[PDB]
Write a protein that binds this DNA or RNA. Structure first.
Lengths: 394, 178
RNA sequence: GCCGGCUAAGAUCAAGUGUAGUAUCUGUUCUUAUCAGUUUAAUAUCUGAUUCCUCGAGGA
């Protein structure tokens, strides 16, 4: 029932027919060797980019993932590919790899080969040992004995394809095409080499691309080579609106009412504002304290009747009530044009309620103000609030 | 509660043609500074010291109480350019880095905006190491000589350590001291 | 400092700030291990070598 909490963690997902992210590597549909390598490497919890890319690579569809530096994109490209190679074994034909990994640098290709050897440890699968600027005879002797994956340079791959040392057959040769640092491969320098690498490939083969940054033109160039791609970045799915300004202040539980009274008294946050509370009795007490302080305020919660809540909503929409106290039920789905300010005095336990409270004000391209009071008790939601502020650009 | 050990000194009998620099100079005779937020307090006039000149009173603070006591015991009825003034406690009132191999004169012949952009990039690189007092770029030198003069030699040494071996525009630039 | 100990007794890596100079602050690791050489007043430091048990997993 907590499938929405994995998507709210901050992982923009785009595409049709996207599988659910896995919580751990033990229930991700991986083989025994990949799980043994993950247990030997010391991975207790998987990365969110890895949890978004591993079912998309296990399902057999094209995926394009973007994340920060050092997030584990090489392991996220090597582990489901090795799991699909171990689960669905094929005949190791001559001079034909089952996977093609493209790296723009020789040191990056050597690091990808070392990561693939560490992910395929305690097994007979040796992928590749080749780099640019070295002896081609040793690389040909290493590739002639058997090659599972092909992680090298595009120039070395073009030289191997021109000298008939390595190529992709038409019927069944490779099933996955990995592209590490796809922003550099889609540039003007590596355009015809990547075009000749993608042209001489099998028709029934998946294409994977991973990079730290991705421009619009590079993504538009890379989307033409894939067939129905699935995008995965951060953050978009269940994220806060960028048009509404978010503010977080560190105050106590008793000082929150004084901060709200100072924002209503000194600043212009009393009129046309929606105040989110934790419970209905606390919202009624805050509404009574606002009405006792010579300020017109209305309240809408589950403890009140439906007609009184409708009258309070009509008074907030018409302009009769300056402030409107509401619970978490009115945070999502409410579309009021008068709600310009969103005062979150009580922080919710879930980030989706805070995202719905921030998105309730300043919609349809308009600006908005959102001020939330962060306390010491909401320490678990501070990381989610920081991730939402980093995704929204606040 | 607290009776003695007061750091607030009230100077009375000051002419309205006085300024704040004179008050700071007079307070420096018995103290050092009281510029906690930005600076120290001054006299409170009618319109917040904007319309009126001064309401015959000025406030002075010091770091220690002994200095304030000595000033009150010595600066009593001090004569300033306009008149004599009294002092009370309360009164029931209130270093050059040289960079080479950075640019070429041939690149500035067909690009008049590349030299200014390179100079702005060099200024933005030199501003992160310290306060740059003077920055010059020799556009007619074949080796690409540039001089960055800062206020402190430690910032110039840090800029020479951070600029040596670094790449700028596809060429390896070198940095040395002066 | 408190009544031998509670790891505030030492060395050391990365980054920030700043001075004419000294410096100041944040985040680590600390070999828990052996032998040979360097070296130190002595440490330190550096330079090299070194299958079994338990419930596919962990420890040695």
């Amino acid at each position: 029932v907590n499938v929405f909490r994995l998507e709210m963690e901050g992982i923009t997902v785009k595409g049709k027919g996207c599988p659910k992210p896995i919580k751990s590597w033990v229930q991700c549909g991986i083989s025994m060797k990949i799980l043994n390598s993950l247990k030997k490497h010391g991975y207790e919890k998987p990365t969110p980019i890895q949890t978004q890319a591993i079912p998309a690579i296990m399902s057999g569809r094209d995926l394009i993932g973007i994340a920060k530096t050092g997030s584990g994109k090489t392991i996220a490209f090597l582990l489901p590919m090795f799991r699909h190679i171990m689960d669905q074994r094929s005949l190791e034909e001559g001079e034909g790899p089952i996977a093609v990994i493209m790296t723009p640098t020789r040191e990056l290709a050597l690091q990808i080969t070392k990561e693939c050897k560490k992910f395929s440890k305690t097994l007979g699968l040796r992928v590749v040992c080749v780099y640019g600027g070295t002896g081609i005879s040793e690389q040909i002797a290493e590739l002639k004995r058997g090659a599972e994956i092909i992680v090298c340079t595009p120039g070395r791959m073009i030289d191997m394809l021109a000298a008939n040392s390595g190529r992709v057959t038409n019927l069944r040769r490779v099933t996955y095409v990995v592209l590490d640092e796809a922003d550099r491969m889609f540039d003007m320098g590596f355009e015809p080499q990547v075009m000749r690498i993608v042209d001489n490939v099998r028709p029934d083969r998946q294409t994977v691309m991973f990079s730290a940054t991705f421009p619009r033109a590079m993504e538009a160039l890379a989307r033409r080579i894939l067939s129905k791609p699935i995008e995965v970045q951060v953050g978009g799915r269940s994220v806060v609106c960028s048009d509404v300004e978010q503010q977080v202040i560190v105050i106590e539980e008793e000082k929150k009412f004084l901060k709200l009274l100072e924002l209503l008294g000194h600043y212009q946050e009393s009129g046309s504002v929606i105040i989110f509370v934790d419970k209905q009795e606390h919202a009624d007490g805050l509404l009574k304290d606002l009405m006792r302080a010579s300020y017109p305020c209305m309240s809408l919660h589950g403890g009140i009747d439906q007609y009184d809540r409708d009258s309070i909503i009509n008074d907030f929409k018409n302009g009769t009530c300056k402030l409107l106290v509401a619970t978490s039920v009115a945070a999502r789905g409410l579309d009021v044009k008068h709600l310009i300010l969103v005062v979150n005095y009580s922080c919710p336990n879930h980030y989706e309620d805070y995202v719905h409270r921030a998105g309730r004000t300043g919609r349809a391209g308009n600006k908005g103000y959102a001020y939330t009071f962060i306390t010491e008790d909401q320490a678990r939601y501070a990381g989610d609030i920081i991730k939402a502020l980093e995704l929204s650009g606040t | 509660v607290e009776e003695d050990r007061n750091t607030n000194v009230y100077v009375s009998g000051l002419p309205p043609d006085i300024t704040v620099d004179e008050f700071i100079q007079l307070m420096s005779k018995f103290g050092i500074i009281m510029r906690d937020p930005q600076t120290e307090e001054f006299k409170v006039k009618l319109y917040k010291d904007n319309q009126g000149n001064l309401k015959g009173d000025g406030l002075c603070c010091y770091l220690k109480r002994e200095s304030v006591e000595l000033a009150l015991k010595l600066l009593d009825e001090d004569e300033i350019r306009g008149y004599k003034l009294h002092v009370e406690v309360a009164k029931f009132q209130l270093r050059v880095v040289i960079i080479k191999n950075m640019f070429h004169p041939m690149d500035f012949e067909d690009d008049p905006l590349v030299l200014n952009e390179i100079r702005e990039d060099l200024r933005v690189e030199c501003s992160k190491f310290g306060q740059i007092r003077k920055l010059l770029l020799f556009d007619r030198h074949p080796d690409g000589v540039a001089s960055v003069s800062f206020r402190d030699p430690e910032e110039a040494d840090y800029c020479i350590q951070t600029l040596d071996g670094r790449w700028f525009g596809g060429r390896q630039i070198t940095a040395q001291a002066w």
